[PDB]
Structure formats: C-alpha cells, structure tokens
UniProtKB/Swiss-Prot annotation, chains A, B:
SUPFAM superfamilies referenced in this protein's UniProt entry, alphabetically: FKBP-like
Keywords: Isomerase, Rotamase, Signal
Gene Ontology molecular function: peptidyl-prolyl cis-trans isomerase activity
EC number assigned by the record: 5.2.1.8
Catalytic activity as recorded in UniProt: [protein]-peptidylproline (omega=180) = [protein]-peptidylproline (omega=0)
Signal among keywords: yes
Keyword hit for Signal: yes
Pfam families to which the protein is assigned, alphabetical: Rotamase_3
Gene for this chain: cbf2
All residue ranges annotated as the PpiC domain in the record: 110-207
Naturally occurring in which organism (per UniProt): Campylobacter jejuni subsp. jejuni serotype O:2 (strain ATCC 700819 / NCTC 11168)
Name by which UniProt lists this protein: Putative peptidyl-prolyl cis-trans isomerase Cbf2
InterPro entries: PPIase_dom_sf, PPIase_PpiC, PPIase_PpiC_CS, PrsA_foldase
Amino acid sequence: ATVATVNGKSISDTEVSEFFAPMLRGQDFKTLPDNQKKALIQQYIMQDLILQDAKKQNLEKDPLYTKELDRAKDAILVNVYQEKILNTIKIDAAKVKAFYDQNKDKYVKPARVQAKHILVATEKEAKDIINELKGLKGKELDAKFSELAKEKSIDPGSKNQGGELGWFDQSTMVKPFTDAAFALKNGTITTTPVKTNFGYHVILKENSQAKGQIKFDEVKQGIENGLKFEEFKKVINQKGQDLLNSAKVEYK
Amino acid sequence: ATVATVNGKSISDTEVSEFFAPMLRGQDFKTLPDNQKKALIQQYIMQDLILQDAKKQNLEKDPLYTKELDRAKDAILVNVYQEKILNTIKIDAAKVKAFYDQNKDKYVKPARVQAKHILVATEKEAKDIINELKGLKGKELDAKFSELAKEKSIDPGSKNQGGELGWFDQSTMVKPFTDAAFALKNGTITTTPVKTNFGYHVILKENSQAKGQIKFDEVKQGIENGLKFEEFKKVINQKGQDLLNSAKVEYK
C-alpha cells in the first residue's frame, strides 16, 4: 500500500517495512504508533532522495562504489552458502545428554571457605594469640579475633580489615594454609599454628560451601550450543575439503 | 601476475591482494613472507571455490541473496555519497585556536587534595584528638593520626585504613569538609573540629594539587576532530534539507 508519493512516485509500506526490518528486530512496521510510522517514512524518503541524487552525480561509476559492491556481492553469496550448511545441523537429545553424563564430574561448583587469619613471624606468637582466644566461641570469638588481627597481624593485605580474606577455593592459595582452613569446623579457629612461607597463621573459619553438582537442566542449552558449533565447523571444513580436492590447483 | 591456476583459470596477485587489503590494514600483500602469501592464496582459492559451488547450487536466485544484495547496493551508494561530503570538510587552524581561546577556562585540571580524617560524634571528642596530636609534625603526626583513626574514628568507610580518603576534588564531598581541607597547609591538621551532617571531623592534609591549565597543544587535535564532526553533521543535514524541499512529497 502507498504511504507516500515523491515527485509522483509511490512509496509502499512494504519497502519502508523491508528497509527497517533489521532495526525493528521482529516487531512489524504495521504495529508501530502513527507518529513512529511517519518518522520512519520520512527517514526512508530521505534515503530515497539521497540515492536519486547520488545517481544524478553518477556515483555508481565511482570505484568506491563498484569495488565495494563486488566485495559485498561475493561476501553475501559465501554467507548464504554457509547459512544453508548451518541449517542442516541438528544435535539430537541423546548427544547433549551423553556429553553431560560423560563430563558430569567437571560440571561442579568447587568447595569454598570463608575465613579470617592472623599472621605473625614466630611459632610462639601464634600460640599466644591461640591462647588469648582459647575458650571463646561464636560472635565473641569473631570480635576478639578481628581485634587481635588489627593489633598483631603482620599481613598488610588483611591486618587492617580484622584479617578478613573473604570466600576462596583450594586453587586460590598455598596448600598448607588451604589444608587447615578446609579441615576446620565453621566458627572455629586453628588450635595449632599453621606454617607457610609467610610465617605462622591463626585461622578463624566463618563459613563453608561444599562442592556442588551442576544439574543437566542448568547446562543443557549451553552444551547443545557448543556441540552445534563444533559440528558446524566440522561440516564446513569437510565441505571446504571436498571442494579443494575436487579442483585442480597449481601454485606458481 | 598469476600466483595460481584453478581448473585452468589464473588467479592474480591483484585479486588476492584486493580481497585481503581490508584485513592487511595498509601493509602490501607483496611484502608478506612467502608462507603468509601462500596461506592467503589458499584461503582465497577456497573462497573462490565456495562461490563456484554456490552458483552451481543457484544460490544467486535465493531471496536470502537478492534481498541482501539490494540492501547492500543501496547502503553502499548512500555511504559513498556521504563520504564525498565528508571529504569537503576542513577546519582551518583559526577555528581550532578560536575554540580553545573561547573555552580556555574549561580546559583545566581541577584542584585536588589528598587527606586523612577522623570522625567522632561529639565536638569535645574532636578537641581531645586535636589535643593528643598538638605539637607533632610530619611523619610522626601522620603515624599517630592513623593510629588514632583506627582507634577512635566512627567512619566505617575509612576508620580501618587509618582514615585514608585518597585524592579528591571539591565536587566530591560536602562543602564544609571540603572548605577546611582545601584551606589547610600540607602535612597539617585541622586545629578546629569541622562540623558536618556526619558529626565532628579532624582532617590531616597529606598533599595538594593546584588547578592546572591544559595547553592548546594537548587538546588541539581533539578540538579539531570535534569541530569537523559538528561541521560534517551540519553539512549533511543541510544537504538532507535541500533534497527534501526540492522534492514534491505527499503523505498518505
């Protein structure tokens, strides 16, 4: 249908609609409010008049045009070709499931701990802190700990924050520290100094999170996307092989 | 020159070179190492064979091709048109200079201070801290300050970091705090409590930076780019006006 005429010539809703369809992302031109339709019609007419003026200035013979049009024409055909190939790719339920089942033990959230620490240079300093805190529990142990860390900790990274280290996993830090911190019960301190390259630590564990299993439903779309893409690449490279072999090719 | 033949047909270095010129970003095909040339020739032959296969499958009549080619053809012409317009745009030295001179007082780096503070709830607590620090100077004033902030400051945002606030300007915070902190000399404290909505502060100023003038040479390219772009938009929109007026347009 004709939504405008320009120097006598009809502009359809069809051509306006097709021009803007990329930008509309699936919303149909016809469903826009009258004033949005009108703005898009104006914009399209302006595009149309710039085209007429460009031809009037013979810009279709400009090599900036013909060379880029040659390029676009080849690139669009190659893309349509690879798109027909993409449309033959389907991963059935069983492959998706089968990939999950095969990798089940890698679809996990790793165990974490939330802890504070106090660092000091000497085994005996660490025992004395341990002493000062012996027999205390819960939020009282926590407050006193942090106060001791601010007071006596030699770790510049945390001393000021009451020894806070936040949540962390086993990948994160040195095993001997990691070992003691995973072994503790929540709300408790290392009753023996932990020895590292940094010195002697006292650790207070606030919380823990056990290794968690990720479920198939959580990851299945991701698995499918990744299998489709791998399959697409295999089919495309195979094709690229059939065509090359097939041809007689000499390098000069 | 012929770098390969494919089923008898010659492939020039010219067409390979033109195909990859976008990706080469100005480096000439001819200057690449032999093994890079060869890989690009292979890639180009593969592109060529996919084109031949696409035509064999009649994909040039596919509407996924013809409709996108119609779109590309219009979009490239419009771009060549606006590119010829872009090429007529020049800002002479005098406009660039003139814009700088006109806005000289906005091309400045604002004054900054680097300070610590201690916050307490009561004017008298603030005087007593001021007391404890009276008569101290330099790095000794600094250490004692930070220790007092850790000890007695009621600001959770900084208390733990010895009251550190880092570098900040006048836009950043409440004027009454800002006022006192800009007035101080480096290495000194507010000898009178500063009153805000948060309570009573003692401020130690570590450093200052005076308002700095940005020089023409620092900003001149930026000014030019921005003037060229504004001018481009003016010329393009004017054009868009000449064309529209010029036409006889009826909206249905």
